[PDB]
Amino acid sequence: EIILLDYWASMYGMRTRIALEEKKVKYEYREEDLSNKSPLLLQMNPIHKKIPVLIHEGKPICESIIQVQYIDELWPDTNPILPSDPYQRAQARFWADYIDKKTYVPCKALWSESGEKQEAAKIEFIEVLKTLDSELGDKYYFGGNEFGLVDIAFIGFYSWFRTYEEVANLSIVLEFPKLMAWAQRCLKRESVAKALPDSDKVLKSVSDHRKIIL
Amino acid sequence: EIILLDYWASMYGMRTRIALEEKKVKYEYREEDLSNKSPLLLQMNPIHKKIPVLIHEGKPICESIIQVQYIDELWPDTNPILPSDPYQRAQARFWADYIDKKTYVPCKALWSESGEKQEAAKIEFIEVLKTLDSELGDKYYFGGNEFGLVDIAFIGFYSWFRTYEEVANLSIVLEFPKLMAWAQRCLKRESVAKALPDSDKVLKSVSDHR
Ligand SMILES: N[C@@H](CCC(=O)N[C@@H](CS)C(=O)NCC(=O)O)C(=O)O
Ligand SMILES: N[C@@H](CCC(=O)N[C@@H](CS)C(=O)NCC(=O)O)C(=O)O
Ligand SMILES: [Mg+2]
């Protein structure tokens, strides 16, 4: 038995969705209302009270990148996610960590803030895009020739690019064509296609929030 | 060849020192002046420009918990650090992540700030202590019956406890005896004994800065 507590537009939740589908395991997806969190969510992640929460045979695993590695280590022979080489594996972990650290606050402020905080966030996220663009280089994936951990770690953000462009006056699509091509590559995988919500859906939800709350 | 670029009182660098010694590998330690970073440091960690940086056969590995896992995966049979069970491994990673996330800002502010910011930091770090104390519970180690990843992730902070008590007016030693006993346990390992600097030395270094 596998349960995933998640939020549809969560790029972190999307990672675990993708990892589960890469392994072709069946699981129960449960949508959480983050303004009205379930007893199960609070019981299973008392420390952070965040989604995604992966519940396997009744036991909780928290933090999306830790969940992906957990899923990979349980089913290593089906669509291996992490490299087998320790050095390459260390590098994949580094770049997933980089994404987590650099996007957590700015990407929240991109859609939830205006004024000075949003401005700061724009600068930081553009810096992330430039850095990831440089790291990707001319490879098909962050993982080189094949879809890997860092691809999983960032692809969910693609579903937000249009939102960031519209609500934060960013230019992403025309400025980072290698990243757009990479995203198009990843989207051909059924795991990714299933996990990522429609970009217009995200945009509509975020603009609604900004109208009503701001 | 293994080079470690580090700063002696860095609790993060201490993790990698410990992991290397757990595996009994020889390596070159290089002390970095963090106010005057070496060209090697800037070349090898251009993204964060932080220590510890582990350089193996000329190739850099950054972030201490990632370095520890790298070292564990290179030499898995000598004093294994991470659990072999995937779920237990996930939990070890979770608690090392918890420590990284909750200590990064407060522990810097404990000695570098005053007023409202230091007060906030004290509140946050005591919460970390209480949470880890609860997680440790009655086990000998965070890793259970044996020294493991989370023990490595936190043990370096012990060498700063006296500093926090003195410069932030915190009470740690008298308030968290299970954590004190745990640290005594860890200190019996040669890796930990080598890595952790004297508590008064750390305090002196911070007092100069303040
Ligand atoms: N580091 C976490 C971040 C997860 C996260 O931020 N989840 C958000 C949804 S996108 C959340 O649950 N927020 C709930 C809250 O903070 O109240 C991970 O990688 O899983
Ligand atoms: N997340 C990093 C943190 C390492 C870190 O913060 N290192 C400090 C020394 S304790 C540093 O290099 N500071 C550089 C500076 O102050 O510019 C890790 O775990 O290795
Ligand atoms: Mg062990």
A178 touches A133 (CB < 8 A) = yes
Q: Return phi, psi of residue A6, to 5°.
A: -150, 170
Element (H, E) at B80: none
- Return the ligand 1 atom nearest residue A32 CA: 12
Residue found under tokens 């939740």: A13
**Cα–Cα separations (whole angstroms), residue A137 to A91, A128, A134, A179, B15:** 15, 14, 5, 9, 32
Name the amino acid, one letter, at A65: I
Fold of A85-214: Glutathione S-transferase Yfyf (Class Pi); Chain A, domain 2 (1.20.1050)
Residue B200, number of CB atoms within 10 A of its CB: 11
Element spanning B100, H or E: helix B86-112
Cα distances from A188 to residues A111, A134, A192, A208, B22, in angstroms, run 27, 23, 7, 30, 44
What's the resolution in A? 1.9
Among A157, A156, A166, residue whose Cα is nearest residue A208: A166
Cβ burial of A64 (10 Å; 0-12, 13-18, 19+) is buried
Distances in whole angstroms, Cα of residue B195 to Cα of each of A182, B11, B44, B75: 43, 9, 23, 19
Cα separation of the two ends of chain B: 38
Nearest residue to A164 via CA among A128, A132, A206, A131: A206
A122 interfacial to chain B (CB closer than 8 Å): no
Phi, psi of A191 (to 5 degrees): -55, -50
Q: Which of A56, A73, A86 sits opposite B89 (nearest CB)?
A: A73
Non-local CB neighbours of A15 within 8 Å, separated by 6+ positions: A52, A64, A65, A67, A68, A152, A153, A156
* Facing A94 at nearest CB: one of B66, B87, B131: B66
Are A28 and A4 in contact by the 8 Å Cβ rule? The answer is yes
- Give residue limits of the domains in chain A: 1-84, 85-214
In the structure encoding, which two tokens stand for residue B26, read together? 């020889």
Kind and range of the H or E run holding A30: strand A28-31
Which residues of B fall within a CB distance of 8 Å from A91? 61
Mapped onto helix, strand or coil, the DSSP state of residue A141 is strand
Determine the angle formed by the axes of helices B149-158 and B86-112, rounding to 10 degrees: 10
Q: Is the dihedral of CA B124, B128, B131, B133 positive or negative?
A: negative
The answer to whether the beta carbons of residues A199 and A159 sit under 8 Å apart is: yes
CA distance B153 to B29: 20
- Amino acid letter, residue A135: E
Cα gap B91→A31, rounded to integer Å: 24
Contact of B1 with B25, CB cutoff 8 Å: no
Distance CA A167, CA A151 (A): 25
Give distance in angstroms: CA of B92 to centre of ligand 3: 10
| Dihedral sign for Cα atoms in the order A64, A65, A66, A72 | positive
Ligand 1 pocket member A64 (CB < 6 A): yes
- What single string gives the DSSP state of each residue in A43-97? HH-TTT--S-EEEETTEEEESHHHHHHHHHHHSTTSS--S-SSHHHHHHHHHHHH
Edge-to-edge strands of the sheet including B59-62? B28-31, B2-6, B53-56, B59-62
* Beta carbons of A92 and A83 less than 8 angstroms apart: yes
Residues 156-185 of B with CB under 8 A from A: none
d(CA B111, CA B160): 10
Question: Can the peptide bond before residue A52 be classed as cis, meaning omega within 30 degrees of 0?
Answer: yes
Give B85's Cβ-side CA count (13 Å radius). 6
> Which class does domain B1-84 fall in?
alpha beta
Tabulate helix, strand, coil % of chain B (nearest 5): 60, 10, 30
Region class of B207: left (phi > 0), else alpha (psi between -120 and 50), else beta: alpha
Alpha-carbon span A44 to A66, nearest angstrom: 15
Secondary structure letter of residue A33 according to DSSP: -
Fold annotation for B85-210:
Glutathione S-transferase Yfyf (Class Pi); Chain A, domain 2 (1.20.1050)
Q: Is residue A100 packed enough to be buried (19+ CB in 10 Å), middle (13-18) or exposed (0-12)?
A: middle
Tell me the shortest Cα–Cα distance from A48 to chain B, in angstroms: 9
Distance between CA A35 and CA A15 in Å, rounded?
22
